[PDB]
Design an enzyme around this catalytic site. Structure first.
Site, PDB file in Angstrom:
ATOM      1  N   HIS A  14     -10.287  -0.031  -7.655  1.00 58.47           N
ATOM      2  CA  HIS A  14      -9.884  -1.414  -7.815  1.00 58.47           C
ATOM      3  C   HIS A  14     -11.002  -2.394  -8.162  1.00 58.47           C
ATOM      4  CE1 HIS A  14      -5.830  -0.484  -6.534  1.00 58.47           C
ATOM      5  NE2 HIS A  14      -6.241  -0.053  -5.353  1.00 58.47           N
ATOM      6  N   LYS A  37      -1.783   8.485 -12.728  1.00 59.64           N
ATOM      7  CA  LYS A  37      -1.279   7.417 -11.869  1.00 59.64           C
ATOM      8  C   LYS A  37      -0.420   6.464 -12.687  1.00 59.64           C
ATOM      9  CE  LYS A  37      -2.788   4.166  -8.219  1.00 59.64           C
ATOM     10  NZ  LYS A  37      -3.811   3.151  -7.793  1.00 59.64           N
ATOM     11  N   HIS A  38       0.715   6.060 -12.131  1.00 62.91           N
ATOM     12  CA  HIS A  38       1.675   5.300 -12.921  1.00 62.91           C
ATOM     13  C   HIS A  38       1.280   3.839 -13.097  1.00 62.91           C
ATOM     14  CE1 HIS A  38       5.240   8.242 -12.100  1.00 62.91           C
ATOM     15  NE2 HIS A  38       4.111   8.867 -12.384  1.00 62.91           N
ATOM     16  N   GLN A  39       0.564   3.263 -12.130  1.00 64.58           N
ATOM     17  CA  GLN A  39       0.118   1.881 -12.219  1.00 64.58           C
ATOM     18  C   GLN A  39      -1.204   1.744 -11.483  1.00 64.58           C
ATOM     19  OE1 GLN A  39      -0.333  -0.598  -9.704  1.00 64.58           O
ATOM     20  NE2 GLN A  39      -0.729  -2.251 -11.157  1.00 64.58           N
ATOM     21  N   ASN A  40      -2.044   0.823 -11.963  1.00 57.75           N
ATOM     22  CA  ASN A  40      -3.240   0.459 -11.208  1.00 57.75           C
ATOM     23  C   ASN A  40      -3.723  -0.928 -11.590  1.00 57.75           C
ATOM     24  OD1 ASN A  40      -5.353   1.280  -9.277  1.00 57.75           O
ATOM     25  ND2 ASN A  40      -6.709   0.978 -11.045  1.00 57.75           N
ATOM     26  N   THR A  41      -4.165  -1.682 -10.582  1.00 56.21           N
ATOM     27  CA  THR A  41      -4.709  -3.021 -10.753  1.00 56.21           C
ATOM     28  C   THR A  41      -6.219  -2.985 -10.572  1.00 56.21           C
ATOM     29  OG1 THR A  41      -2.689  -3.991  -9.879  1.00 56.21           O
ATOM     30  CG2 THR A  41      -4.671  -5.376  -9.947  1.00 56.21           C
ATOM     31  N   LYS A  62       1.525  -5.379   4.531  1.00 53.88           N
ATOM     32  CA  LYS A  62       2.833  -4.774   4.267  1.00 53.88           C
ATOM     33  C   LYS A  62       3.212  -3.720   5.304  1.00 53.88           C
ATOM     34  CE  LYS A  62       3.395  -5.448  -0.693  1.00 53.88           C
ATOM     35  NZ  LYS A  62       2.696  -5.183  -1.967  1.00 53.88           N
ATOM     36  N   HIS A 118      -7.972  -1.188   1.043  1.00 52.97           N
ATOM     37  CA  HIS A 118      -6.709  -1.078   0.335  1.00 52.97           C
ATOM     38  C   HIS A 118      -6.408  -2.392  -0.351  1.00 52.97           C
ATOM     39  CE1 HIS A 118      -5.787   2.586   2.381  1.00 52.97           C
ATOM     40  NE2 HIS A 118      -5.812   1.999   3.561  1.00 52.97           N
TER      41      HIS A 118
END
Length: 123
Positions: A14, A37-41, A62, A118
């Site tokens: 990240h 990986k389907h998404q990452n920021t 969360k 995280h």
């Protein structure tokens, strides 16, 4: 690095102080996990500056823990969305606040009071 602390993996996933192309930046991450990986920021700020968010007021995460912390201002980010090992991504520029979970450092981490582990939320 064969093995990694939670905070080191957070940095790898990240922390991207200078923008890269998604296809290049995701390659290393996808090699450690053996999947696209389907998404990452990616956050465009230094590890030191993201780690400073951990010193701000704690808030709920969360997962219902209370070791989360919200950035004081938005930051520029890149959102990579999968469109193996030939993984190809679309990219979107974003400017958003974030929330990180932080823990005390493990032995192999830099000796801050707390380190980010995280990416809980973008908002």
């Amino acid at each position: 690095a064969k093995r990694l602390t939670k905070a080191h993996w957070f940095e790898i996933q990240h922390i991207q102080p200078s923008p890269l192309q998604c296809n290049r930046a995701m390659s290393g991450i996808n090699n450690y996990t053996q999947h696209c990986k389907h998404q990452n920021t990616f956050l465009h700020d230094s590890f030191q500056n993201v780690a400073a968010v951990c010193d701000l007021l704690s808030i709920v995460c969360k997962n219902r823990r209370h070791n989360c912390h919200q950035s004081s201002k938005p930051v520029n980010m890149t959102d990579c969305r999968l469109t193996y090992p030939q993984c190809r991504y679309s990219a979107a520029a974003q400017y958003k606040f974030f929330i990180v979970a932080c823990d005390p450092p493990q032995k192999s981490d830099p000796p801050y009071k707390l380190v980010p582990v995280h990416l809980d939320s973008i908002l």
